[PDB]
Every structure is written in C-alpha cells, then in structure tokens.
C-alpha cells in the first residue's frame, strides 16, 4: 500500500460556495465558509490555510500560500440530494438518484394517515421542534391520550415521542419500524426514524437513553464494505457509523462534540491499524448551520483549526490526511435546509516533502472512495476517479 493509514475528516456542512446546480435547490448565493468569514471580519484558520484552503478559494482572513502542505481542490456533488446521507454515501463510492426529504411544514397527511391506520394510534404535533419544545407543548396530551407525538428537525428525520409509562418501549420500537417501512417511499423518504421515549410529568419531561434509530442502509456496497471484507480496519468516529448504518465499520467511537471528535481522531493516530479512520465533525451542521448562527459557526471553525497542529505532528510518512465536507449549510441563508455547494478537499501526508499542488476539480465526491479503494487494493467503486497517483 502507498499509505498504511488514511484519516478522512468530514467537516459536516462546511461548504465552499454554490455549486453549478444550486438554482435547482433555491441555493443561489450560498457560501458557507465565505459568509462566515465575512461575519467574523476574517476567519482565523491558519492551519487550514497552511494546508491550502485559500489556494482552493480566497476568503476573508483565508489567503493562498506559496507552498501548501498538501494537495487541494474542491469537489462537486453528482447525486440528486444535498443531505448528509447522500453526501457521505457518494464520498464512499455511490451515486444516489433519490434524495432524502425534509419537512419544514410537517409530514404529508397521507403518510400520517397510513401510520395511524397501521398502528391504531392517533398522531399529534407534526412539525419541526426540539425534544424539549415538543414535550413541553404536547407531553401531557400524549400521556393522557396514548397518542404519538410525531415531529422532525431541520434534517431528514421522523421522530416519535411517547412516555415510557404510557406506551411500552417495545411498542414504541414496533411503531418506529412500521414508520421506517412507510418512509421507504420517495415522496416521504426520511433518512432516519428515531424513537424518542421520555419520562416524567408535566413541566418536567426528560428524554431517556432508550432512544433507538432506524436508518436506511446505503444504496449499494461502499468502499467501507470492501475495506472491511478485505480485513482492513475501518474506524468510524462520531456520526459516521450511524450515517452508513454500520456498513463496513470495524470499530465505532462515539463523540459528543467537535473537540471530542478531534480527541478521538488523536486516539486513532495512536492506534496501530491498517485502513481507514473516518471522522465526522457534526457541530458545524447541527449547532450552527441549521440554527443560522454564523458567529457560533465561525468560532467552531476556529476551535477546530487550533486542534490541527497536533494532528500534523502525529501523522507518519505512510499516513494520509483527507479533509472535506458533505454539502453546505450556509448560516446566512433563508430557511433551515442545507445548501447545494462545492466542498473543499485537502490531501496531506508528511511524505509530501515539497508540498502539494492543485488537483483537478473532483466531479463526484466518490473520487475520495476511489482513492481510498485504489490505495488499499480493494474493488474499485462504480463511480469516482482516484487521485492517488496525483499525490
Ligand atoms: Mn436554499
Ligand atoms: Mn452533513
Ligand atoms: Mn443537517
């Protein structure tokens, strides 16, 4: 193998400007990093800059360097959707025609009608809400009626809340499995059905650790599957395992924050493995992009950047670091959805003694999967063109 270990970091939602097909999505003008940089009066990301972020695109506080540490370019999404699952599935070598849906005005009556028809239970709520908001509003009604609180977030999810002392956990799980079947329908296609059991009393409801997720498997066998099948390590950090529903994963490390994600990345650098370590930094999307909070987003990017020099120090000659994103989520954009954007790609190994160069623009995110597959000599994905030889 050219590289013994590849460290792949997805800065979730960290887009680098509207894609050629942004108009289709109502995403004209979208620019995640650029708008944040403007809000911050210049972003402080000296390490990403050293890698060549400004060489991809110059933005406020983010300038090009003469000798970037590694190779750089951006990637264009080929799949139809701009959601997390589509982006990640494409990165690992797939092409996804059918987009996952979001529901800012709640779910269509037709879906909720069938769920009622199959479960024998009434549905209340049917809107985007945090767990706390929806429970304060409807928790008491739920307890008194045995109805199901159905709600969503800004992402492609269908969440079902029920009090553990009113709806048995096992019954809630059965209901979520029914909802999971009904939502395998392109009209209602949600990435994830989530059981949200809760306990307590009016004015004091708490969601329990008995949350269960019902995800769809990737629409194809991914480069991760092939790595696992060839006895390579595939270490998933953060939301990665969930995003792929465990497919191709050999070890999964849960994280609770971006900083914790970087700590686990550091943990994997200290591990003797051969294969892939794959981190998702989710705070960018979950805490800042969807909440349209450019200040919080900017601070998070600066916090992430400050962690990088330790990563640089731990990389070996036969390690490769890949940093990218899965879509945009411009925190100064209308609405709460993601934005259709190019994503940055930075590829760095300490063995690049003379620094890196510009790569041709990646015409699909699957170019990452193809590169990983070629490196480890496993079956090449159907989509994607490897840039391994360019490095
Ligand atoms: Mn938009
Ligand atoms: Mn995402
Ligand atoms: Mn999102």
Q: Assign 3-class secondary structure to 64-108.
A: CCCCCCCEEEEECCCCCCCCHHHHHHHHCCCCCCCCCCCCCCCCC
Cα separation, 269 vs 303, in Å, equals: 20
Rounded (5°) CA angle 60-64-67: 155
Tokens of 120: 């024998």
The Å distance, Cα 293 to ligand 1 centre, comes to: 15
Residue ranges of the binding site for Mn(2+): 12, 285, 290, 326-327, 338
| Nearest Cα to Cα of residue 85 among 64, 63, 101 | 101
The Å distance, Cα 335 to ligand 1 centre, comes to: 7
Are 365 and 225 in the same domain? yes
Are 305 and 344 in the same domain? yes
Cα separation, 122 vs 341, in Å, equals: 40
Are 314 and 344 in the same domain? yes
Are 313 and 224 in the same domain? yes
Q: How many domains does the chain have?
A: 2
| Ligand sitting nearest the alpha carbon of 290 | 3
Are 114 and 3 in the same domain? no
- The whole domain housing 351 covers 1-97+217-391
The whole-angstrom distance between residue 371's C-alpha and the CA centroid of its chain comes to 20
Q: How many other C-beta atoms are found inside a 10 Å radius of the C-beta of residue 229?
A: 12
Whether 13 contacts 27, CB under 8 Å = no
| Ligand sitting nearest the alpha carbon of 155 | 3
Could you say which of 167, 193, 216 is where a domain stops?
216
Are 128 and 10 in the same domain? no
| Nearest Cα to Cα of residue 337 among 69, 33, 101, 77 | 101
User: How many separate helices (H) and strands (E) can be counted in the chain?
Assistant: 13, 13
| Ligand sitting nearest the alpha carbon of 332 | 1
| Ligand sitting nearest the alpha carbon of 327 | 2
Using left for φ > 0, alpha for ψ between -120 and 50, and beta otherwise, residue 8 falls in beta
Whether 235 contacts 277, CB under 8 Å = yes
| Ligand sitting nearest the alpha carbon of 23 | 1
Whether 245 contacts 215, CB under 8 Å = yes
Cα separation, 345 vs 322, in Å, equals: 7
The Å distance, Cα 89 to ligand 2 centre, comes to: 11
3 state DSSP class of 180: helix
The whole-angstrom distance between residue 292's C-alpha and the CA centroid of its chain comes to 17
PDB experimental method: X-ray
The Å distance, Cα 193 to ligand 3 centre, comes to: 15
Residue ranges of the binding site: 12, 285, 290, 326-327, 338
Are 152 and 16 in the same domain? no
Pairing mode of beta strands 343-348, 275-281: unpaired
Task: Report the CATH number at residue 368.
Answer: 3.40.720.10
The Å distance, Cα 213 to ligand 2 centre, comes to: 17
Are 264 and 378 in the same domain? yes
- In which residue are the tokens 């060549």 written? 52
Pairing mode of beta strands 148-152, 123-128: parallel
The whole-angstrom distance between residue 86's C-alpha and the CA centroid of its chain comes to 9
DSSP state of 121: -
Whether 263 contacts 248, CB under 8 Å = no
The Å distance, Cα 67 to ligand 2 centre, comes to: 30
Are 124 and 37 in the same domain? no
The Å distance, Cα 13 to ligand 3 centre, comes to: 7
Tokens of 97: 């025609």
Cα separation, 28 vs 20, in Å, equals: 9
Could you say which of 192, 216, 240 is where a domain stops?
216
Are 107 and 123 in the same domain? yes
The Å distance, Cα 280 to ligand 2 centre, comes to: 9
- In which residue are the tokens 């809000």 written? 39
Q: Measuring CA to CA, how many Å separate 249 from each of 141, 229, 244, 254, 294?
A: 41, 10, 8, 13, 33
The Å distance, Cα 153 to ligand 1 centre, comes to: 16
The Å distance, Cα 145 to ligand 1 centre, comes to: 38
| Ligand sitting nearest the alpha carbon of 152 | 3
Are 264 and 372 in the same domain? yes
Cα separation, 331 vs 333, in Å, equals: 6
Could you say which of 216, 242, 259 is where a domain stops?
216
The phi and psi torsions of 150 (rounded to 5 degrees) equal -105, 130
- Counting other chains too, the contacts that 195-198 makes at CB distance below 8 Å and 24 or more residues apart are 195/160, 196/131, 196/149, 196/159, 196/160, 196/161, 196/162, 197/161, 197/162, 197/163, 197/164, 197/167, 197/169, 197/172, 198/131, 198/135, 198/139, 198/161, 198/162, 198/163, 198/164
């Amino acid at each position: 193998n050219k590289y013994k270990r590849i460290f792949l970091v997805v800065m979730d939602s960290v887009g680098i400007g509207e894609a050629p097909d942004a108009e289709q999505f109502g995403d004209l003008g979208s620019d995640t990093i650029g708008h944040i940089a403007e809000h911050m009066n210049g972003l402080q990301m000296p390490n990403m800059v050293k890698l060549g972020l400004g060489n991809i695109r110059e933005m406020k506080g983010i300038s090009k360097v003469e000798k970037p540490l590694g190779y750089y370019t951006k990637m264009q999404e080929k799949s139809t959707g701009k959601d997390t699952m589509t982006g990640h599935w494409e990165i690992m070598g797939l092409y996804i025609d059918t987009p996952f849906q979001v529901f800012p005005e709640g779910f269509p009556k037709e879906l909720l009608d069938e769920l009622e028809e199959k479960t024998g239970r009434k549905i209340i709520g049917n809107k985007p809400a945090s767990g706390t908001e929806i429970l304060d509003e409807l928790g008491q009604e739920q307890m008194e009626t045995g109805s199901l609180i159905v709600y969503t977030s800004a992402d492609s999810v269908l969440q079902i809340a029920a009090h553990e002392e009113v709806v048995p956990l096992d019954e809630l799980y059965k209901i979520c499995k029914i909802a999971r079947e009904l939502t395998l329908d392109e009209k209602y296609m949600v990435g994830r059905v989530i059981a949200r059991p809760f306990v307590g009393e009016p004015g004091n409801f708490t969601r329990t650790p008995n949350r269960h997720d019902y995800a769809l498997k990737p629409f194809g066998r991914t480069v991760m599957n092939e790595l696992k099948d060839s006895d390579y390590d595939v270490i998933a950090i953060g939301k990665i395992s969930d995003i792929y529903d465990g497919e191709g994963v050999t070890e999964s490390l849960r994280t609770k924050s971006n900083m914790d994600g970087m700590d686990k990345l550091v943990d994997t650098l200290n591990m003797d493995f051969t294969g892939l370590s794959f981190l998702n930094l989710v705070d960018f999307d979950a805490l800042f992009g969807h909440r349209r909070d450019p200040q919080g987003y900017g601070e998070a990017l600066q916090e992430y950047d400050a962690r990088l020099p330790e990563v640089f120090a731990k990389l070996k000659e036969d390690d490769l670091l890949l940093i990218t994103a899965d879509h945009g989520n411009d925190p100064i954009h209308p609405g709460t959805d993601h934005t259709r954007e190019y994503v940055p790609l930075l590829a760095y190994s300490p063995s690049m003694k003379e620094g890196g160069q510009e790569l041709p623009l990646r015409q699909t995110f699957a170019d990452i999967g193809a590169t990983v597959a070629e490196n480890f000599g496993v079956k090449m994905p159907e989509y994607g063109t490897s840039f391994l030889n360019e490095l």
